[PDB]
Write an enzyme that holds these catalytic residues in place. Structure first.
Site, PDB file in Angstrom:
ATOM      1  N   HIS B  41       0.808  -1.220   0.000  1.00  0.00           N
ATOM      2  CA  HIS B  41       0.000   0.000   0.000  1.00  0.00           C
ATOM      3  C   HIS B  41       0.846   1.277   0.000  1.00  0.00           C
ATOM      4  O   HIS B  41       0.281   2.383   0.022  1.00  0.00           O
ATOM      5  CB  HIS B  41      -1.019   0.001   1.173  1.00  0.00           C
ATOM      6  CG  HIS B  41      -0.417   0.076   2.548  1.00  0.00           C
ATOM      7  ND1 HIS B  41      -0.216  -1.038   3.335  1.00  0.00           N
ATOM      8  CD2 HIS B  41      -0.008   1.133   3.283  1.00  0.00           C
ATOM      9  CE1 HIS B  41       0.295  -0.671   4.498  1.00  0.00           C
ATOM     10  NE2 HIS B  41       0.437   0.645   4.490  1.00  0.00           N
ATOM     11  N   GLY B 143       2.684   5.843  10.085  1.00  0.00           N
ATOM     12  CA  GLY B 143       4.080   5.904   9.708  1.00  0.00           C
ATOM     13  C   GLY B 143       4.874   4.671  10.079  1.00  0.00           C
ATOM     14  O   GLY B 143       6.006   4.518   9.603  1.00  0.00           O
ATOM     15  N   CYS B 145       4.001   1.507   9.322  1.00  0.00           N
ATOM     16  CA  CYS B 145       3.836   0.374   8.425  1.00  0.00           C
ATOM     17  C   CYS B 145       5.171  -0.006   7.810  1.00  0.00           C
ATOM     18  O   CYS B 145       6.005   0.855   7.502  1.00  0.00           O
ATOM     19  CB  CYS B 145       2.817   0.691   7.329  1.00  0.00           C
ATOM     20  SG  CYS B 145       1.163   0.599   7.988  1.00  0.00           S
TER      21      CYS B 145
END
Ligand SMILES: *[C@](O)(C(=O)NC)[C@H](CC[C@@H](C)F)NC(=O)[C@@H]1[C@H]2CCC[C@H]2CN1C(=O)[C@@H](NC(=O)OC)C(C)(C)C
Ligand SMILES: *[C@](O)(C(=O)NC)[C@H](CC[C@@H](C)F)NC(=O)[C@@H]1[C@H]2CCC[C@H]2CN1C(=O)[C@@H](NC(=O)OC)C(C)(C)C
Lengths: 305, 305
Positions: B41, B143, B145
């Site tokens: 993503h 932030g 991920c």
């Protein structure tokens, strides 16, 4: 969201850990530039331990008696000296992995990370607090002496603790990196129990703010208190007095949540007088006191190093 | 002595963390040899999130659209591909700090360390368990991920988790390093709550053994139980069934302490049926289930890496 007891990343300290052997005693040392720091009792055997004369034992050692190993490579010792309860071994090679660092003597109530090591190799990392009675609640086995505690700020490692001993009830005592003990303790195998500990009030408040930030709000009541009236209650429950400096340090968390420090104090007073009644806060059934205000902000705002 | 929730030393993973930016989205990646692994993503904006078509979005990206930064140095991307929910960005430079590693898909009930990172820089390290419902109880902000979870064995880093999302009640979901989610979750912003969790019985038993090793023995009763009769009680309290494999894995701790697993089960049964009555075990007022048997042995025997 979420709130965990969170240690600093340990890599910068890992690169400084070595093994120091003198005679039949092996423990850990900290290699920074061309100096290895370790507990002075590396020069002792077991019998030496009831009441060693370290100055006398050290006079009969010379450089070559210290076997310093960084991984598989022996570091040649070219000088040595004692500073309080630590030995400083000058070696002929500077550690290329030395981080920016400082030596700092922390205050009771402050937290730090411990890199537990054996034979110069890291076992694990965990977060501790310097207790009001100058012990820490660590996890240390024989062979861990010389393991260090530290904070990081950006790129700078502030070393604050070196491990020396275990006191009754499984709590731990050690020195700063200048070799001065925290608390009244001495590095000898003699009776010397810790004073009665107390709960770090400003840290409990910080952790209640962490709970609010995470949406765990059930304990907030509708009242306020004066600082003086709160401290009369804290005294009864063996909590440390809350000072105006503490109130100011809680300012950032108070501002973020809109809850005045003295209002949070009224909620804590109620928890102390009434208990939790089987409820949890941030997953804990007890009030937690090993997060500082800065720890809460760092974790809830994503501060990196 | 002492018993702490103890993370693995994080240095070997720190040396693999990078920042990946595509458009206005920045998150973390894992740089091993000449490949950077990150959540797919990264190629999404916010609007994309309700139901992205990742294959379609990726077809319109090319190598140069991926800004990979290792500290202050940009790594040139020379190929890319998607594997399940992860992107693999081939870069023209192999990471010289790559440790010996494996990718492993862990089982519910197993533990690992998380290195929480923002903008490719480490914030902290903590120990988690893969819950029976395939979530983890972490601490993650926007932030984070691409932050990974891992175990170490000697010199080998077994990567088992990459962070993707937060589910209701502040628990976390992610993938293995082949990009397959743990649990039934998908990487899109749609309703998908976790199943009801359960307590990891074998881990509670391991932690009771840790308590005995540390001298905290008050909960040991004089009885034994059958496995079947214990599991009837565990069921009522939302504990996972104890299997013979679990009993065998507890063998080392049982042998060390001289307490047969089924005798420890009788003590746990009593704690479940009667509570702790305001007492603590290893400082906890609740029964702890995020230490595996191996975690207890590693910490109580000083296993290093
Ligand atoms: C370090 O010296 C070490 O790792 N050496 C290889 C050890 C670490 C033990 C863990 C459990 F903390 N500490 C000691 O053995 C210290 C010795 C150096 C200073 C005093 C010596 C005894 N000692 C102890 O910790 C004892 N503590 C004590 O006497 O406290 C009053 C004891 C735990 C061995 C009883
Ligand atoms: C990562 O995408 C990230 O760090 N990006 C820079 C974030 C991390 C958030 C922390 C709190 F875990 N995760 C998300 O924002 C993910 C997105 C990727 C997959 C689905 C997208 C939404 N999302 C969420 O975590 C949402 N979860 C959700 O929809 O669960 C049902 C939510 C927390 C934003 C509501």
């Amino acid at each position: 969201s979420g709130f965990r007891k969170m240690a600093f990343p340990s890599g910068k300290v890992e690169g400084c850990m070595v093994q120091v052997t003198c005679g039949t005693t092996t423990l850990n040392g900290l290699w920074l530039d061309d100096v290895v720091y370790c507990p002075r009792h590396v020069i002792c055997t077991s019998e030496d331990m009831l009441n060693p004369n370290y100055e006398d034992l050290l006079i009969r050692k010379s450089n070559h008696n210290f076997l310093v190993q960084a991984g598989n490579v022996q570091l040649r010792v070219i000088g040595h000296s004692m500073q309080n309860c630590v030995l400083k071994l000058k070696v002929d090679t500077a550690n290329p992995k030395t981080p920016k660092y400082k030596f700092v003597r922390i205050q009771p109530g402050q937290t730090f990370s411990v890199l537990a090591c054996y034979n110069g190799s890291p076992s694990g990392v965990y977060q501790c607090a310097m207790r009001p009675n100058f012990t820490i609640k660590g996890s240390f086995l024989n062979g861990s002496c010389g393991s260090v505690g530290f904070n990081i700020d950006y790129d700078c490692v502030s070393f604050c603790y070196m491990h020396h001993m275990e006191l009754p009830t499984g709590v731990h005592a050690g020195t700063d990196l200048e070799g001065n003990f925290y608390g009244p303790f001495v590095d000898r195998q003699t009776a010397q129990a810790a004073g009665t500990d107390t709960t770090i009030t400003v840290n409990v408040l910080a952790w209640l703010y962490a709970a609010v930030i995470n949406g765990d709000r059930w304990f907030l009541n509708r009242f306020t208190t004066t600082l003086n009236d709160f401290n009369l209650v804290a005294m009864k429950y063996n909590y440390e007095p809350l000072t105006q400096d503490h109130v100011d340090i809680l300012g950032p968390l108070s501002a973020q949540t809109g809850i005045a420090v003295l209002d949070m104090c009224a909620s804590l007073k109620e928890l102390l007088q009434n208990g939790m009644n089987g409820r949890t806060i941030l997953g804990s059934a007890l009030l937690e006191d090993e997060f500082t205000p800065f720890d809460v902000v760092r974790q809830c705002s994503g501060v990196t190093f």
